[PDB]
Amino acid sequence: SQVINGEMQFYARAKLFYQEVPATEEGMMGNFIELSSPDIQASQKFLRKFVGGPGRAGTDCALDCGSGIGRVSKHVLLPVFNSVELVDMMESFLLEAQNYLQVKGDESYHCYSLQEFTPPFRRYDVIWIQWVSGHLTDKDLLAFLSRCRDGLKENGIIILKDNVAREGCILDLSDSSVTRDMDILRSLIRKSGLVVLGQEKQDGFPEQCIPVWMFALH
Amino acid sequence: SQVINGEMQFYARAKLFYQEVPATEEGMMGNFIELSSPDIQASQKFLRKFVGGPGRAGTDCALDCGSGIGRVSKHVLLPVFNSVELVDMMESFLLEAQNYLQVKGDESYHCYSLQEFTPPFRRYDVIWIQWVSGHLTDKDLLAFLSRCRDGLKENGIIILKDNVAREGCILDLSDSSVTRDMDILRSLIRKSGLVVLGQEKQDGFPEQCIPVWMFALH
Ligand SMILES: C[S@@+](CC[C@H](N)C(=O)[O-])C[C@H]1O[C@@H](n2cnc3c(N)ncnc32)[C@H](O)[C@@H]1O
Ligand SMILES: C[S@@+](CC[C@H](N)C(=O)[O-])C[C@H]1O[C@@H](n2cnc3c(N)ncnc32)[C@H](O)[C@@H]1O
């Protein structure tokens, strides 16, 4: 089994990559902007199943991790939650989030790398982690997921939505990302102290695309 | 088994790394300048076994691949060969090679990345490839070794000297290098169309250090 070292360069390259990504919906999606509508439709449906009623997540506060300009906040979180906070390492995306989300400007915008971020203690009903876990190493993802657990209000949930490789991991040096497989991802979730409440595979995506999964964790 | 993509970024990072490496012997060795003397002593001994006499390599021309400033050219090749040529992607190291090798200046200095280099046809008695194969991907190393084969004069040899992992490969993102193991390296050599004439393990190195091997190929 292969050993990969150079964490500092792994993170430094993701910053150089996102420095040239446009602060637009198309830049957030990559080469798959036509996939934003079915991505959003599936998230809204999956989310609703775990919110409202006794023992389910509340609707006061949500956290959008690796938010970018706030694509998930706009179409998924802001319609459901009274207040939504955004966390992203890129100041550029957080500034554009102000125009993209059409807010007065003007606290809800956190500029931190997730591996250096502690979600405020018991603040959130829902913590959303979409298309960003792949940018964290196995060690940093495990520690971040355990910290997200303490950021949860009573009956709060973490929603992890990402690419899940068929079998075997895929490392991409261009954007410094890892496409984990189901075995590796479930291990990290279990080790962080989280349990899977539910899971759904993203439908409506072309057969060529790597499978996309949704997990409800607590 | 893991899939690694992003060749362009893999090569782009090695250039950024060598841009900050000093054009000195200490910079060529890394954090192991005290290891240059036993490295040189072992190379001189290994080389002599495959040069001179019927059916062995001649002594007219040698090529130093990933030469740097010409550490191997200075202490190994220039005492044996009538003329020695250097190939390195870094112009900085090739310019310093002029002062380091104490030459008039002032054709013998080739500024090319090995994966974009074709050793001149049947020009060399010996082609030296030391502490650079790790910077080539498996595909580019295989193709380069097959091209080195055509750069060889009759009875010429390729001397490959590098770090060989115990079992399993080690990828280092900081300098964009791979420490191949014996199984992977021997496969690439066989696939390039080369056969092993001889092999020796580098002695006199601390127990902590990754094993260093020498191969005589043709
Ligand atoms: C593919 S975009 C996804 C944006 C958003 N989650 C969506 O679904 O539209 C990845 C985002 O993660 C952010 N990011 C990448 N690595 C990060 C890290 N280690 N810490 C924080 N943010 C990071 C990037 O700045 C970018 O906004
Ligand atoms: C560790 S230094 C070794 C220098 C020399 N072989 C020695 O033993 O002193 C690695 C050298 O390979 C060069 N190099 C790295 N990747 C290269 C590539 N793809 N093509 C050509 N030269 C490369 C660097 O510029 C540097 O001079």
Residue numbers in the entry:
A (entry chain A), B (entry chain A): 59 to 164, 167 to 278
Task: Copy text from the publication.
To determine the molecular basis of different product specificities between NTMT2 and NTMT1, we solved crystal structures of the NTMT2-SAM binary complex and the NTMT2-SAH-SPKRIA peptide  ternary complex. The NTMT2-SAM binary complex subtly differs from the NTMT2-SAH-SPKRIA ternary complex in that the turn of the β-lid of the ternary complex is shifted closer to the catalytic core, which facilitates hydrogen bonding between substrate K3 and both D232 and D235 of NTMT2. The co-factor SAH/SAM in the ternary complex is nearly superimposable with that in the substrate-free binary complex. Based on sequence alignments, the N-terminal methyltransferases have a conserved DxGxGxGR motif located on the β1–α4 loop, which is involved in the SAH/SAM binding.
In order to unravel the molecular basis of the substrate and product specificity of NTMT2, we determine the X-ray crystal structures of NTMT2 in binary complex with SAM, as well as in ternary complex with SAH and an RCC1-derived peptide (SPKRIA). These two lids cover the core domain that contributes to the substrate recognition. We also identify that N89 serves as a gatekeeper residue to control the entry of substrate into the active pocket.
